[PDB]
Amino acid sequence: EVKRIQSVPLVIGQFLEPIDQNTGIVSSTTGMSYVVRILSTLDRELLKPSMSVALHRHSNALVDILPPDSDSSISVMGENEKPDVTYADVGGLDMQKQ
Amino acid sequence: AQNWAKFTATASLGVIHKGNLLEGKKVMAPYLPGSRASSRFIKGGSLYGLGLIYAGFGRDTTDYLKNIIVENSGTSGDEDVDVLLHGASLGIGLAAMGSANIEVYEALKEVLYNDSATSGEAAALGMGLCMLGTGKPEAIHDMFTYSQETQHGNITRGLAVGLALINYGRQELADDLITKMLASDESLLRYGGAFTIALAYAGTGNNSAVKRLLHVAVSDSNDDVRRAAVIALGFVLLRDYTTVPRIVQLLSKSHNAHVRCGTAFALGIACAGKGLQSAIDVLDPLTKDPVDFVRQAAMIALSMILIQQTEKLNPQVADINKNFLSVITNKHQEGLAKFGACVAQGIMNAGGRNVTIQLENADTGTLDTKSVVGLVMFSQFWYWFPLAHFLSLSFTPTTVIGIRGSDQAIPKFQMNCYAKEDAFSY
Amino acid sequence: LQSIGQLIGEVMKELSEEKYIVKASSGPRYIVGVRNSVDRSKLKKGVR
Amino acid sequence: NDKVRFIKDELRLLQEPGSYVGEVIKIVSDKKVLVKVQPEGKYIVDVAKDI
Amino acid sequence: TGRDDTKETVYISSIALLKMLKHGRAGVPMEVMGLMLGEFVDDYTVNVVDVFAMPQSGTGVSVEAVDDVFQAKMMDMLKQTGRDQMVVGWYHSHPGFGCWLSSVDVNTQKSFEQLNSRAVAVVVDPIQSVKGKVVIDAFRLIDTGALINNLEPRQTTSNTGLLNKANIQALIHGLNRHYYSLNIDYHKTAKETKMLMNLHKEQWQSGLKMYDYEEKEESNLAATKSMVKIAEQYSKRIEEEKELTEEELKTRYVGRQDPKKHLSETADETLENNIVSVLTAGVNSVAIK
Amino acid sequence: MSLQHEKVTIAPLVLLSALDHYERTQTKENKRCVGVILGDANSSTIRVTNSFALPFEEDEKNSDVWFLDHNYIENMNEMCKKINAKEKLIGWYHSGPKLRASDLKINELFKKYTQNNPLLLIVDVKQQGVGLPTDAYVAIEQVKDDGTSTEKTFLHLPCTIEAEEAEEIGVEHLLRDVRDQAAGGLSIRLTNQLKSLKGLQSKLKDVVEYLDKVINKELPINHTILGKLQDVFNLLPNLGTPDDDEIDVENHDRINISNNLQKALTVKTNDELMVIYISNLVRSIIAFDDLIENKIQNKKIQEQ
Amino acid sequence: TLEEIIDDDHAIVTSPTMPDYYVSILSFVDKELLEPGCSVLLHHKTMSIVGVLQD
Numbered sequence A: 001e002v003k004r005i006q007s008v009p010l011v012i013g014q015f016l017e018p019i020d021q022n023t024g025i026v027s028s029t030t031g032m033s034y035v036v037r038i039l040s041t042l043d044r045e046l047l048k049p050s051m052s053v054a055l056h057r058h059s060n061a062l063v064d065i066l067p068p069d070s071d072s073s074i075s076v077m078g079e080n081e082k083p084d085v086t087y088a089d090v091g092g093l094d095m096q097k098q
Numbered sequence B: 001a002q003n004w005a006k007f008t009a010t011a012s013l014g015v016i017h018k019g020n021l022l023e024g025k026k027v028m029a030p031y032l033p034g035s036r037a038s039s040r041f042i043k044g045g046s047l048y049g050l051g052l053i054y055a056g057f058g059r060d061t062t063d064y065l066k067n068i069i070v071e072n073s074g075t076s077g078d079e080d081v082d083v084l085l086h087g088a089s090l091g092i093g094l095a096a097m098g099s100a101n102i103e104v105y106e107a108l109k110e111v112l113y114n115d116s117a118t119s120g121e122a123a124a125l126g127m128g129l130c131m132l133g134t135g136k137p138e139a140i141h142d143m144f145t146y147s148q149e150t151q152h153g154n155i156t157r158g159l160a161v162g163l164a165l166i167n168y169g170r171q172e173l174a175d176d177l178i179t180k181m182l183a184s185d186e187s188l189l190r191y192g193g194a195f196t197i198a199l200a201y202a203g204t205g206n207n208s209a210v211k212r213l214l215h216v217a218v219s220d221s222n223d224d225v226r227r228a229a230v231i232a233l234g235f236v237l238l239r240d241y242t243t244v245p246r247i248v249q250l251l252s253k254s255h256n257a258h259v260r261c262g263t264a265f266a267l268g269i270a271c272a273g274k275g276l277q278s279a280i281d282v283l284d285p286l287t288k289d290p291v292d293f294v295r296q297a298a299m300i301a302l303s304m305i306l307i308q309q310t311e312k313l314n315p316q317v318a319d320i321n322k323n324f325l326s327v328i329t330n331k332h333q334e335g336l337a338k339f340g341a342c343v344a345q346g347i348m349n350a351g352g353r354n355v356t357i358q359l360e361n362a363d364t365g366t367l368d369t370k371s372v373v374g375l376v377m378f379s380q381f382w383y384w385f386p387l388a389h390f391l392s393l394s395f396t397p398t399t400v401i402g403i404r405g406s407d408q409a410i411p412k413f414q415m416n417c418y419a420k421e422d423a424f425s426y
Numbered sequence C: 001l002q003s004i005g006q007l008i009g010e011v012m013k014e015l016s017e018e019k020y021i022v023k024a025s026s027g028p029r030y031i032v033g034v035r036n037s038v039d040r041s042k043l044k045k046g047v048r
Numbered sequence D: 001n002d003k004v005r006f007i008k009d010e011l012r013l014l015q016e017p018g019s020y021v022g023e024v025i026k027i028v029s030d031k032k033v034l035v036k037v038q039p040e041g042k043y044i045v046d047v048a049k050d051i
Numbered sequence E: 001t002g003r004d005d006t007k008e009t010v011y012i013s014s015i016a017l018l019k020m021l022k023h024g025r026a027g028v029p030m031e032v033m034g035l036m037l038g039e040f041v042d043d044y045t046v047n048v049v050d051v052f053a054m055p056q057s058g059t060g061v062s063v064e065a066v067d068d069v070f071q072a073k074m075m076d077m078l079k080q081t082g083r084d085q086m087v088v089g090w091y092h093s094h095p096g097f098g099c100w101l102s103s104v105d106v107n108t109q110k111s112f113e114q115l116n117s118r119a120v121a122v123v124v125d126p127i128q129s130v131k132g133k134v135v136i137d138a139f140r141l142i143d144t145g146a147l148i149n150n151l152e153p154r155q156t157t158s159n160t161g162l163l164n165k166a167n168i169q170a171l172i173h174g175l176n177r178h179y180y181s182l183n184i185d186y187h188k189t190a191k192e193t194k195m196l197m198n199l200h201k202e203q204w205q206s207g208l209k210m211y212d213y214e215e216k217e218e219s220n221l222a223a224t225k226s227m228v229k230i231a232e233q234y235s236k237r238i239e240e241e242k243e244l245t246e247e248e249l250k251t252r253y254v255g256r257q258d259p260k261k262h263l264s265e266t267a268d269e270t271l272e273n274n275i276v277s278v279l280t281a282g283v284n285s286v287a288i289k
Numbered sequence F: 001m002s003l004q005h006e007k008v009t010i011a012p013l014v015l016l017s018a019l020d021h022y023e024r025t026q027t028k029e030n031k032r033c034v035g036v037i038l039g040d041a042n043s044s045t046i047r048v049t050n051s052f053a054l055p056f057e058e059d060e061k062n063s064d065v066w067f068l069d070h071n072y073i074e075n076m077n078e079m080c081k082k083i084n085a086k087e088k089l090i091g092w093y094h095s096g097p098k099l100r101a102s103d104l105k106i107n108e109l110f111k112k113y114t115q116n117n118p119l120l121l122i123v124d125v126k127q128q129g130v131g132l133p134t135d136a137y138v139a140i141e142q143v144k145d146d147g148t149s150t151e152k153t154f155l156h157l158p159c160t161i162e163a164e165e166a167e168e169i170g171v172e173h174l175l176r177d178v179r180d181q182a183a184g185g186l187s188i189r190l191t192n193q194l195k196s197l198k199g200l201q202s203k204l205k206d207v208v209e210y211l212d213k214v215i216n217k218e219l220p221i222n223h224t225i226l227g228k229l230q231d232v233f234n235l236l237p238n239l240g241t242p243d244d245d246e247i248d249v250e251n252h253d254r255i256n257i258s259n260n261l262q263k264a265l266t267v268k269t270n271d272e273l274m275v276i277y278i279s280n281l282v283r284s285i286i287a288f289d290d291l292i293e294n295k296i297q298n299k300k301i302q303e304q
Numbered sequence G: 001t002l003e004e005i006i007d008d009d010h011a012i013v014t015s016p017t018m019p020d021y022y023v024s025i026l027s028f029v030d031k032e033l034l035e036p037g038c039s040v041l042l043h044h045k046t047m048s049i050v051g052v053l054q055d
Helices: B003-011 B040-054 B059-071 B079-095 B102-114 B119-131 B137-149 B153-166 B175-182 B187-200 B207-219 B223-236 B244-248 B257-270 B277-286 B292-305 B315-329 B335-348 B369-378 D002-013 E014-026 E068-078 E103-115 E144-155 E169-178 E190-197 E213-237 E246-252 E259-288 F012-024 F070-083 F103-111 F165-174 F186-215 F223-234 F242-303
Strands: A010-018 A023-028 A033-037 A052-055 A062-065 C009-014 C020-024 C029-032 D024-027 D032-036 D042-046 E009-013 E033-041 E045-053 E087-093 E120-124 E136-139 E184-187 F007-010 F034-040 F045-054 F056-058 F066-068 F088-094 F119-123 F134-142 F151-157 F159-161 G002-006 G010-014 G020-025 G048-051
Touching (some): A023 A052, B003 B040, B040 B059, B059 B079, B079 B102, B079 B119, B102 B119, B119 B137, B153 B175, B153 B187, B187 B207, B187 B223, B207 B223, B244 B277, B257 B277, B292 B315, B315 B335, C009 C029, E009 E014, E014 E033, E014 E045, E014 E087, E014 E184, E014 F165, E045 E087, E045 F012, E068 F070, E087 E103, E103 E120, E136 E184, E144 E169, E190 F012, E190 F165, E213 E259, E213 F242, E259 F242, F012 F034, F012 F119, F034 F070, F045 F070, F066 F103, F103 F119, F134 F159
Parallel strands (some): E009 E045, E087 E120, F007 F045, F088 F119
Antiparallel strands (some): A010 A023, A052 A062, C009 C020, D024 D032, E033 E045, F034 F045, F034 F088, F056 F066, F134 F151, G010 G020
């Protein structure tokens, strides 16, 4: 019944800080702070560092969790987007290199 | 009053005139079929209120009613023929209560074959009352088969209950019927099976009956079957009614609200006749249960226990009365909750604080048919809100009157218990 | 009049095939469902 | 029994009216507290019976 | 009157529940729709046998999406196979709302009342159901003229009824206006149930197969070595447990990231597995040979 | 046509309809329901979306006398495509209650319509087995000599299920069961291992009786069939060899690990014990404070 | 924050949340106790100056 209240659509919060194990403080990316109850069959093992989390729009409740990779505008480049400029391409500044 | 509200209203009158046969027929007389009525509800529910007065004297009234039944069991689809045929069937069922007139049984059985969508519930119950407590296999064969074949909701309910009705005091002769019903997959036949154990094994406590009904509540996930199994424990266990709170303590910790709702009726049934201080402690979180129909059962169940008692000799009655009034007034409570409070208040001060619901007579140490049939009927009403006037068969006055037994009139009672005045005349 | 306006967003980054993260052009990040015509290989980060 | 009673009514508890976090600026003597909710204006508002 | 009037208990058979959900889930986020085949018996007992969908010629839930030819053609087909029976309602989907009809869908329901006296409009939630169980509710619309002069209470008595407050306030206004809502029940045949419970057929073969034993040895090594690494933490954890209160412990010293939980669980997993492994292999040698 | 179909996964709904359809047409044995099968194919995964009934009358006096409503099929195909375009004709179901030699006359009628080889789903409608009673057969065409030159025959393919979000939950919703075809937990896998042994004994009888019927009830000697049977015996394990010995060493390793893993669990369980007795320790101080408050309360009772 | 006072028992108050409002001035306040710049206490449902007992 609790896995059926994780319905789409959902809005992203970011967990600010614990203050209980069925209550925490989130910080919405709407721009409002809330003090929300935490759903069960969710571990608090990984709610401890500040991480993205999914919120239910019409009540403000932590209805499921997101992995720390999601919800960034940035990404790790270098897949093929890194320059070709090695140590070899740079000329001197041997002191600065070392 | 309109609809079934009017069907209730013409019937309340027989509560009033219960035990008075003199003006018995007379009071319902204008409202009887073939005379002046504004609506069908009057014509039917007048026969209903007639059967409440005449139960156990009803040989006169049985005969009248038979003519009404064959009339309306050869026509249908007209609203009038149906609403009439329902109240007539209740009438005749009470009137033929315990006589086992075969002619009445056949006539009620045509109502089912006529396939009225309304009347077949009344008529199925009425049948079960007529033949009551013989356990006759032929009767059961008729009632079980037409239950499987029809899919009609009102009709099927009636006949599963009727299979339970006819078995009473059978005990260990109900074992074939009990197993068959609890192994049907329909909810209706499971529901009545629980009550087959209740009525049969009433008046005598058994180890067996208890093992078999705990299995039912747990094993079935349909909410009505869970309820039915709890109620049934009360009836078997009205011999020792001081074991009952101890069992159903457990069954009031239940997540399922139906189970909780049935625990109310069991303590009701056991602890009706004599008050018990243990029982009040169990019924206390049921008034505080946050599911509307659990409050509904609970409030009524408290009133029946503490019936025929003052408020100045029991601290609870004062608080519970005060509460009933709180529930009625609030428009912040649902209608289920309002039903529980009003109806319980009326059971408590009933009769002028001079009638009790007896749990069984101790004078001979046997069970009394009128009381039992009254309560099991009472416990059914979420499926039909009109039916809760059947408690008039189970309100018995208990009172000391001296009789000069050599001319059978009433001279004023003089007790060895001493008088004291209450000192008011202003 | 039998048409509606549709809030434009962009796929911020894939979570799963049923659930995508779309950041909308009004502020808040949402976690959204799919139409099943929308091609799953056409849904990736940058696309509007 | 605590586990199954708890999950079942927890759904009605997740029909939350919401919350906000402010901070006590100063009190007043009508039993009211001036709070500033963080990206909003201040509210002069009464305490419950919980504090 | 012609009848006392009360709202139908819907005994929705297995095939119809399952079918409306398939069609409507596929149709997210569009409105989806189609007609209900059934039979009306008793004072409230509607058995819905099957459903069939109505091809979209509109946006869905329109009278541009209900085609006369289509309706005619489907009926004409159902006679050959005996599935022809009378229309007992119509289904639709809101996947953006709970069970609560919108203004357009009331207008669709107003046209169905002309067609059939007891037609229901059934709102199927394909994703938005708020309980473990599927939330579906059936509505019927009767005139404002009976409801206002206070005949609505009479109609709702002599039945258990259903109250929902899924959209809270919005629902109540709508509920009121339309009519009522009543418990929905499910008709199961024991043929139907048995097919559904079995889902595999090479289950008998599979229970006496196993994997290569190279990756089994690998799981056993990985399990033992990993439990050393959380066993190191586990000793450190019980240095603490010096702070009063269960909650304070979890917040302050991060008692939730528990080493205890991850050891017990990983020991359990490798353990249960090695019971089965020995069981399967030891059966295989002596049974087969 | 393609013979590339290695699995068939069938939705719960397809099974449930075809089965449901058998009593909706009110047919009994030796009268057939057949219906159109709609879904995806041309792929390894066959995904069976939906089905609808056809009228079907079988006369078995001559297996060349048959009823099929032709026009019905074309009409219905076009309407379904407007709800959802992924529905194509991928075959037809036969209602059982067994296979015949006769299903091949009928199959030809369905090759006509299709661009895959029609799937012949023999749905057994009394429902025998602790598995699914649904067989899948696709007609495969290959040159083969067993008294024929070119054979059309039907090759079995596995039947399993796959379901949507909605459809799975709707199954679960009907069921009051926790499943036991899952092979999830310890409990579930125990049940399964015993079902597997019972599955194996029953098939072996069917093989044992088939062979008694050639040699004593005189069916013909079928070299090709036996040939296959022979290899069963050839690829048997043989013990009292180092192979048997490698198993013994294997047993030792796994049971050692079970003991070492279990010893971990002996700490876990024991550790917790101490923690409860801590909770009992705290509850007596709390109960003392209560006992003091309740001492005072009793004086009020006397007073009043 | 009282933005300007309009002489008719109405005022333009600036909630710091940004919509400005043509409010009415009710009881428990005086209009020479309000000066531009003064803080005002506003009725939530229909905005009105209900006072300022503030320090």
